[PDB]
Design a protein around this ligand. Structure first.
Ligand SMILES: [Zn+2]
Ligand SMILES: [Zn+2]
Ligand SMILES: [Zn+2]
Length: 178
């Protein structure tokens, strides 16, 4: 196994995958690394199994159909993995915890949102369709762009949204376009 957390790239108390060489902090993995289960397989491994069981699942899909899917176990997992792919980027730190808004010339968003809130909502099974999860994730970046206006810090929202969108298209096999 690797000697660093796959998500945050630090050492520490790490749980090792049985079917691949990745390792995780307990609360860096999503879902949080399970109490027992020997062997244990990481989310990366579980996602790869879905693809291997149903190779046609990699054929192109329309985003509108994906969003309307109900959050059955495989879609739950896919959203957990997409969330984890965002935490994998170090720039996710800016969006992880609850924000506050006090900048001259700007007003805070009407509906604040942040990654740990989306993480709790997934854990609590609060999303009934893929659309709910995707709307909250895009809302994080949209709130940031609106609030920061012409400050160059706006760019952090563009950067982390690009990580989200590339991973969304990969994980849910969105049909490639020009
Ligand atoms: Zn970690
Ligand atoms: Zn694994
Ligand atoms: Zn199949």
């Amino acid at each position: 196994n690797s000697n660093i957390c796959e998500v945050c790239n630090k050492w520490g108390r790490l749980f090792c995958c049985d079917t691949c060489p990745r390792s995780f902090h307990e609360h860096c993995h999503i879902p949080s690394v399970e109490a027992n289960k020997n062997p244990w397989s990481c989310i990366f491994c579980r996602i790869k199994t879905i693809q291997e069981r149903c190779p046609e699942s990699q054929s192109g899909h329309q985003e509108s159909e994906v969003l309307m899917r109900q959050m059955l176990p495989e879609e739950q997992l896919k959203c957990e993995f997409l969330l984890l792919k965002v935490y994998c980027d170090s720039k996710s730190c800016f969006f992880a915890s609850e924000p506050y808004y006090n900048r001259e010339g700007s007003q805070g968003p009407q509906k604040p949102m942040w990654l740990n809130k989306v993480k709790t909502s997934l854990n609590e099974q609060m999303y009934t369709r893929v659309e709910g999860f995707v709307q909250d994730m895009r809302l994080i970046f949209h709130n940031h762009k609106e609030f920061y206006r012409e400050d160059k810090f706006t760019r952090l929202g563009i950067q982390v949204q690009d990580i989200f969108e590339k991973n969304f298209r990969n994980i849910f096999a969105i049909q490639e376009t020009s």
